[PDB]
Symmetry: C5
Subunit: 260 residues, 5 copies
């Protein structure tokens, strides 16, 4: 692609606004936004996580207004994003485990992963396994032909984030060797007791242009939005723990760009 | 609206200065600024929090000087905010029926989950409902997401409301709706965890500019300014181990100017 | 006051001093410490002893007399820092061992670090943790307290006009006043909070407002106020005392012409 | 070398690669982990096994060959100008469901946490190392390259301990640091976060660039058309059901942009 | 007294060196460590041994001699303009195998953690000190230089306690701080991080420069062509298997660029 001039005028811009729901595992009809209770296999060899226990990446493919070698493409220029429902984590009165005698429920805390991406094509994934002997369950899409090298880097594990409730968070990351046409941002905050720190504002914009002033270019007039918002773990009265996730809002401003 | 020029001169500017009190539940005549002690339900199905156990959003509707005889009109535009949590040093009272942190020690200070939030708008803050637990029974006297479903635990677009009443909208059920709020500027931080330390900064030297990327602030419909806040600072643990939310008031000073619009 | 031009040339002066902390000083050996904390069994019986209450520090500094349409001293810049930060490395003076054979628990827990520069007394607003607290003789505290005093009672207005008198826990700078003062403070709460104290002679704070005007010194007096509660010292017994440190101030002033 | 003008026009190249971590790999299933940590019975008997010691990672990357023809008083060198880098596989640390120790009764497994070292360098020659020992009486194992003729001074600064990071799986992290008195032709960056419970904080983005130019606008100059990349990404320790702890490391991605620079040699 | 123009051309020099820590060095094997910490039986009987007290480090570095010929109303002085600095040997704190106290049953040794003081200064004369005592009744030991004629006022501010950092291994860290009322000809920077579980956070890079010029564009001016470097790098405490705890320190690297400045008497 040779990138030429931006189109100007009233009809040269469009905006996408939507929310991606989290896919934490949803172990029953009452537990949307939660995983199944976490269990611990006795050995790496016996690690066989239940589908319902594995958070997955969220993805939405958004069709844009139809535009057309010498063509126009939608270019993603800005992003506003927000985690939706941060105050829900103040419910410390619902089937929780008291922190001490007579105390309030222990709040959602521990390992979090907050991730979002905007691209002109599916997010490209690289597989990395904590334990190459993990048996990923039917219904998930996971690194195939895993070897002990999969624990650090096995270049065979390439995928596209092209399906919902399918790609487990723990075995996939954005592939830094690809994703030229995507902007991605993520933070893993580890530890058993790390407190969530969640900021909300409608005053913050991320610019998606690269160092050449070029944003993601939407192939086939499709925009790809991806997210993960594992906020931590909910501890119930028994001490068992479940991942808890929240939805993510996206607002993307796009402009027409001529390319060859 | 088409937004046109700012009016200048002595008469073109006004200021709002006020404080919003916290609405933490106020369980008796001695406990203004505190919630009821927290109780925990023994199942998701049995969650039934009492009204005095639920912190609520604070809101004030501030009438501004009348601009038009009949509403090509003038509107008050909010341009700058100075804000501060009032009484941060009260959290140094570690001698008042607190739980000793160890044998012969001082009282445990207020700590744990906090929510610090403020907004300035030309209309009521627009809320989206999100529920930790869709089967929670919210109490009479509160305004809460209705017709809740399991989808209410992640995103149910039915739960739309206006922050239009004080001591009514529970903090835990509602957030600013990011799909709306074009005419409001909002800012909030949830710091979770039972041990997190409050970090509270005070200064009279800090200003927030409320102008958007087009140089336009909140425009006050009907000449009303809307101020909203939550300042849940954490939990107070008393000698028994019982925990209560503790809140503090928030100071607002907003500078406004007259702006011509075509509406 | 119409504020007119700055004088140039005899037109500048500097104030440099240390403000000592007022932590309660419970005996002849314990300057910089409070009495050990004791806890009431009810809110209604909260009756803290004077030597258990840290107070605001204040100094009124007479400047060179002006005007034998007048000149006023304008405060323009501040250098400040906490003096004696390294004294908190004394972990051998009859403290509580962190574990068997261990060093003494260092000073830690709730801190309040606060400083102000003004051309008049710092203006205060009272806020009470517990409106039924009985404040002791020889302190100046919110009077006619009601339950509304726990969140905001506008009757509680005062001037920081006396050293060792205004308890820290029942007063804050009044944000509705203090037009002629610049103040800065941080409360860090929690029994395990680590002190984080920075020292440098390279950092300057500008005291000019949005209009280029610093505090103007009424009657040619500069007002410096401070609190530096660093945390609590834990004795071998488990008893805890507030520990405070002195604050250095260097203020540069210039002569400014004003009308009345 | 006096640095002259940048060549313009085939005047720019890119290196993209990843460096695997070298944590000790104690068996055929534990690539990316160390052996479980054992504690010596006395300070003077410290004697860590090779598979218990994380080492520095290094790769030397050949660049397009310059100066094929005889030149007179001048050569071209590849100059490293920008870096994008990140840790690969940060989400793997969300596996709290295998062989772990419950945080509390009925809880999930304790995640990887505790001491971390995150380090990367880009240079026109091998990273220069200085040795500093926690304990000068530590017996370092066969197959490692460690500070030799150690004395009690080695615990603070013994200027004899000079080395080049010129071998993978060999230089123990705990023995060596970048030599701040050398490394003129390298840019290095590292953070040690100590403590038994410290939580990993790992950021990923493809939007962040580090500029490698010094205060004169000159990046690392690649001697012999070779680029040296070095890394350590000890993320923390994994705790087994038994309580035994193993270091866990992750791979590092590098993308380096280079331009041809004329120099008077 | 009057600072005039910078000399150009011969006109620039660099100082590069390390300052070793002075943590107390309680025996021939324990350079960089203090004596294990003991606690007094009463507040009034506090009496720390010399080898239990970290001290300030100082080096005076001779610069190229200036003003070899008679001058008239003016001299040249070396002016310190920039500083690169870093802690040397940060990775040594990853030794969790050397007879430390296990974090839990079968776990690795507790890393160095707890209270830290990281301090450095560059000046054209000795660092000026002010004494502040935690406890004015502490008995400071023979071989140290400590605030004398201590009173209860010494616990917050006794202006009698003025000193110069003019001797290595002598001025205990806990007794002394930079005097903010003096030090016009020094630039100093320090952070105290207090608490028994405080994790070390130590960054290393050769890409960060501190500018030493004041608001008038003048750096420290070196009296008698001597540059004073001072440091403290108490990284935390090491916990032995027994539970006993020792301060652990590390060396600090300094690189200072200086230029010749003309000054009028
Ligand atoms: C820093 C400090 O001084 N620490 C001491 C502490 C404080 O002085 C107070 O808590 C301040 O309010 O006092 C500690 O002992 C409290 C008891 O003191 C007993 O008196 C003793 C005294 O401790 C000794 O210094 C003296 O040799 O003998 C006195 C008479 O026996 C009181 O009788 C008893 O009621 C308590 O007040 C404390 O642990 O709180 C000791 C600290 O070292």
């Amino acid at each position: 692609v040779e990138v030429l001039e931006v189109k100007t005028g009233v009809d040269s811009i469009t905006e996408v606004e939507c929310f991606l729901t989290p896919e934490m595992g949803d172990p029953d009809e009452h537990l949307r936004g939660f995983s199944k209770s976490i269990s611990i296999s006795d050995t790496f060899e016996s690690d066989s996580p239940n589908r319902d226990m594995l958070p997955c990446y969220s993805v939405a493919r958004i069709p844009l207004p139809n535009l057309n070698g010498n063509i126009l493409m939608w270019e993603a220029v800005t992003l506003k994003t927000e985690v939706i429902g941060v105050t829900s984590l103040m419910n410390v009165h619902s089937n929780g485990q008291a922190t001490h005698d007579n105390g309030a429920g222990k709040p959602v805390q521990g390992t979090s992963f907050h991730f979002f991406s905007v691209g002109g094509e599916a997010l490209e994934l690289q597989g990395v396994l904590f334990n190459y002997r993990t048996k990923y369950p039917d219904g998930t899409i996971f690194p195939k032909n895993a070897t002990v090298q999969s624990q650090v880097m096995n270049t065979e594990h390439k995928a596209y984030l092209d399906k919902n409730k399918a790609y487990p968070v723990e075995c996939w990351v954005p592939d830094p060797t690809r994703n030229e046409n995507t902007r991605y941002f993520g933070t893993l905050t580890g530890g058993e007791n790390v407190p969530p720190v969640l900021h909300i504002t409608n005053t913050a914009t991320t610019v998606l242009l690269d160092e050449f002033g070029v944003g993601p270019l939407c192939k086939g007039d499709n925009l790809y939005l991806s997210a993960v918002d594992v906020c931590g773990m909910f501890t119930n009265r028994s001490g068992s723990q479940q991942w808890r996730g929240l939805s993510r809002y996206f607002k993307v401003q796009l402009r027409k760009r001529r390319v060859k």
